[model samples]
Target: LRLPSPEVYRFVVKDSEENIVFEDNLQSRSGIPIIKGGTVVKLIERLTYHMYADPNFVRTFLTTYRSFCKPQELLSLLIERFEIPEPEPTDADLKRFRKEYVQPVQLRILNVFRHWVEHHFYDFERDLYLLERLESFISSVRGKAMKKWVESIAKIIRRKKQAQANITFESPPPPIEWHISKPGHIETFDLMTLHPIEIARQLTLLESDLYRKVQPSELVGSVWTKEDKEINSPNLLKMIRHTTNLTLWFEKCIVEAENFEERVAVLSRIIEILQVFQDLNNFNGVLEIVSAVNSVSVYRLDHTFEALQERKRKILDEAVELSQDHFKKYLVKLKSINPPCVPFFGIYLTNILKTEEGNNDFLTRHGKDLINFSKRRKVAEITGEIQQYQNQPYCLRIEPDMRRFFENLNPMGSASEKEFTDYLFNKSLEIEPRNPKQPPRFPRKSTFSLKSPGIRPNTGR
Candidate 1:
């Protein structure tokens, strides 16, 4: 009975006599009716209720039901609903019941099956028994009108199965010339070699592609954190891996600079690229860059910080603020922005995990067991935002060389987390040691360093 938002209106249900049968405050944020919690059987029955008045409900149900209901259970329940017996001939209202209830319910069940087969054929493709059960049910239908519809469903399923069996082998594209040859002749590629905007564009394209491929099933029930995460949530893991790689690569680039000025130059270029990511509405890219700059290895470099230009420092600070306060500002910015953006996946993952942990899978109500569908609805709302952004891809073209470079970045090769962190920290200290015996001074040739009263560097313990 709690309101989801402040902008809700009273939703009252009345019977034929206009007496209030039920009432509650309701809000349709996505313009779809939110289903109420009920027993598993009752919930499945609602799928074909009132001649399927709201098609969106069925769509939403089918899209997110896996969070709480197995596909097999749903299929069997649908079959049971379709097979409900017609009213007895001795009953006075038998003709009316058959016309008003039996026919519509049966037809709606068939329509649900058709929608399921056409849109989410993978469920049938995965389970041969489910497909066989559906075919058997189709075979049992005696009504001439319903028989045609059932037959069409079977035909589509058959085509999908046949198409899936015909595997097409695709050879990989030829390696670009730059990546093909020997030691000195091989062209070196890195972020600094590319234009800032182009870097942002490629990063957006890469992250957006990964984001778009994430399926709803991978996110349901927090499977990403499970032991079989690699198998069940490969796309999600790929995105996470890319994020970590980018962060590590950024740190490596900054630390690899030979002197104070070059390090500052590299940092400034990265911040500029981060700014471009912001302009392009790539929130995931922005966060990765921000994380890199704010990482302990990079953030502890007080000497380098003192050397960065005032404008670039201000931009980094603004970007850093967006990720603070549990990404509160980030969420606001994500909501305000238009599509074709890659949202930070961590927030959605956390939301899904929290929802799963806080809510039970089943509820006992009025001495009856009910599937707690409201919990599934809450999780679906989060995944729905992800799906919305996934549909609108970035318009940028993928530059093959830069894409190849990013795709091959393996910054953590053979190094554990502790080893990598220690190595980077050592590199940071070596570049600009804290508490230097001689006061650090910028080279006379440096053009970007701002003149400021020097403050003593903190001991980076």
Candidate 2:
């Protein structure tokens, strides 16, 4: 048989010719197709192509079309399956048609309907609106699977709304701890004995872990919810450890030294630590070291600093200046660099809080059409920066044991309470009487002498 011209079947025919239907070979108006088997499968293929290409018809079929048949009821048993109001072709239609949706067939249609709904109505309100209509459509069939699919969509929308509403910036609870397996193990390590790059890598790895734990939700929330306190605990824990170790290390060096020479040694080490921070581009570490060196107790001993070599003092002055601008120096450097560099998260979090405080939840436009668009964009902005930075490789590779050690560090430290100040006063008194250059013979096996940096000397125990 010769196939007819495409146009022969394309137009509707009222007066009969070969058009009585040139496509009398084509199936009828109902969704039930009849072009199965043999060479005429080509007609079924052409019919499906036409249906999808006609946007208006496809749209209505997906969104508004309904077939209200009970699941167990066979459409083959019911005339209304493709029932028509028009007159007979009825005898011929009856003889030729007996199609019914089996369970899988109905589910497939439901999936198609869902895809169309999602494609057109992706936003929350519109998605929910169409879902409400879909609930009614599925209600006719009692389809448990279709109902669950709709419920899942509903659940996702709920989470999205809840996430948008729950912004926070304050410290989250279930605090991160500082683990100390043995006290002074960290304090005893002479900075001069340690490789600066090793130190930098250690600090950088810790820095990366902190950044890793900062969840996008937490970043957006600004304030951690009580429930998520534990979830965000490690981020805060590592930060405190990072900050405290700096202070304790510097303090130990100062308070534990036996004489002016030992004190000067530690001070020199502080300068070296500063240089390492610079080499590592660790602004966060730099800030912590600056805080430690210039801490009230450490600075109270004027002579300890006064004895510093000029070049070291110059380096110290540079650290002070770079640290002085409330981290404006850090910011300028950060903006100028290519990353694989650690960020000073404290400053970043502060500015992020500032940005959050400066804005409303969303900008309401035209009274009803909100640009909650801003919150969405802000989330993507912070999360994008986070993910991009996360991909950059750090020079440091932390050992799993070391990483676990830091993660479990106990965050708490003792309050020395002007003891360092009092020690300086006594030192000021004792050293003033002796020649400043001639070192006093300090007692052997002494407390506050010849122990580790922070350790007071042994009592012969």
Candidate 3:
């Protein structure tokens, strides 16, 4: 006798408060992009609604996201969301009592916990982390079919272990581009041939090296105290040293020049370098260049600056304007531009670091020590930006000699403001007053002062 088709039930969706935390429908698309905040909230609501209605229904849909997700990860929540079905009595008639009725329902319950070894494994370490959390939930599933599913997944995980074992390492050769000869001397270098492209290319290569070295772990620590700020990563340390070196290089090139003409020429080259930096969307380069020029040693040389051509001087003013902390003209420009660009990471890092240091690390009301998840989210966002640059289809070739040149150049060691002021005092004597009508217009350098020695309010005495 043909059995009537199993009774059907309408899929009723209902939101569960517990399932609202994790994202859902992140892969949705329309003719135009939608605001992520509103989209994400709505997405989570839908997933939460589907969660309680049909547990297996949610499983098959979410499996498509990040295909590397293992069956153990998918079942971890599913098993916890449910309990086992009651077993029917031990019946002699197989078809009547077990196979056709109660047994089928129990087997269907086990299928929800079964591991489907369909996708190739790529992220093994992450897989282990996800699977480790699934053990408590695994006990809920029992049967021959479920047993076979576990065995299949185990074999796949085993092969992945063996695959990882065969991995090897080798030293990479230096880029052929780095082998080229150096240009002219500091005073007479050919500015025309110094392609902004080459400068950008070198900066891109340096960013790659520095970016790879920073681990997600390093991004979490304090930014204020030296003890907490200490970066264990060698690459991150290299990035700091190199940035300092560039700042000094700009200052030294202008200061050590023979005469006013040479100093202006040096400043001109520095300006050109910054122009390239801005064009390439590399703000770290631009900031350091501006910092070097704004250094007390360079800024106090009014006579030297007067020798600069009007065109070059205009460039210098614009560079300073674009780079200052308050006016991130470069950042504004970045929004209007396309990708395959490097951002000024310092801006984002400093802003977030301030947020971390200035505020309490824990949410006292929520009573969580690590409820500082807000800071972690910001760090993750900046890290994502860094990863995008590395993954994008940008190209650049770095020269070895350029790095050697960068390293070998001597810059003035750390000195007090008094020392720089005294040097400027002695040097100003040698600067002849030109046209006496125009006294050298030196830009004011802001520094500490005690309110101009407040005159004692003369008492009537």
Candidate 4:
């Protein structure tokens, strides 16, 4: 469906009793006044309004209705709406009655089904019953103008079914031997061995892929944090898990260093990789690294910090500062950057959680209860921002060996949070004793620094 030219209109949402519940000026391009709350029947009525003036509302309903209602229920309702009787020809002003009323509503019903079938084809693919019901409705449809629509829907369904039946899986690529300089001899390859830029690129590629897989329904209502989240929000959970694992792995690498000099080198290497992440617009990667460095286990090592060069320390400090104030600085940086960026997902989650918590699911006005659609809209806006970034994949190639190394990092293993924390803390204290009475073993002595490939000016390709 296409949207008309932008127009400003005042939208007032009211309960069934006609008491005003919410009101605002619809100034945004494609902004349509939404209903406050209603039963499924009432919602369907509004969804298939006779005028069909708001395509945006239709799109939103179709995209998000799964959160509140089942696909089969929606299909039944759309068909029911389509079957509403038309005015008789014997009645006065028959032409006006059909032209201005029944025909438009019925046509719009067909259009909605057309959109659902075309865009959300998976809905049909998942349930053969729904497909059959739709086909039956199409077979019952009359009139040449409407016939074409039903025919199109039937043809699309047929093609989709054929494609589904013929699906074939491709064979996986042969595994490559992961090793260091010697090709024949097996040597363990790790993330640290890769160039910082390559590490950042591969990390971005992996993360962006995960971020893109997240479905809008998974994020709706912040379902990822609920008890049933495993089933309802698996993709979102995977993204969060991946993020946590990366952070823990970074901390483990830093704390596991044998000596203070090696620990500083590892820290510096991580900082350099973070800089590359910044340049590549991988805010998620940058946050993961920052979270690791700023974590108590690594942050408490003053000896390690003291050994870092002034330039590297400055970068680390700047990163820490940017991530502070609830990421006020990071959000500003995110806004200023272009696409192909993996934004820190935590900010969006926080906004979603707060929005859900602060707003009532149903509005109570004048002893009447209505679904507070405004809250859902607010949530949708945040998820919309997430999806906007998901569409722009990074223009970087994945290095299989490096990706394999990263994928294998199980930093915390099966340990509990306390156990992991204790292990890291003990490791940290061992590397650099909390209080050293004698002069430090690894004093600041090196002028060596890793040159960073500076931030590339975003052409916004």
Q: State each model's CA lDDT, in order.
A: 0.70, 0.47, 0.46, 0.70
lDDT of 1 by residue, 325-411 (tens): 989888889989887688888788888888999998666444655566777777777878787787775655567767777777888
TM-score of 2: 0.46
Stretches of candidate 2 above 4 Å error? 1-193, 224-228, 355-388, 397-461
Worst 10 residues of 4 by lDDT: 3-12
**How many backbone overlaps does candidate 2 show?**
15
Output the better candidate (2/4) by TM-score.
4
- Among all candidates shown, the one with the greatest TM-score: 4
Off by over 4 Å in 3: 1-204, 212-217, 223-234, 365-370, 407-461
TM-score of each: 0.72, 0.46, 0.51, 0.77
Segments in model 1 whose C-alpha atoms lie over 4 Å from true places: 1-35, 50-52, 85-101, 122-142, 151-187, 227-232, 256-259, 335-339, 364-369, 416-419, 422-461
Better of 1 and 4 by TM-score: 4
lDDT tens digits, residues 122-191, model 2?
Answer: 2223235444554454456555655676565455545555665772324332211122222235543334
How accurate locally is residue 313 in candidate 1, as Cα lDDT from 0 to 100? Answer: 89
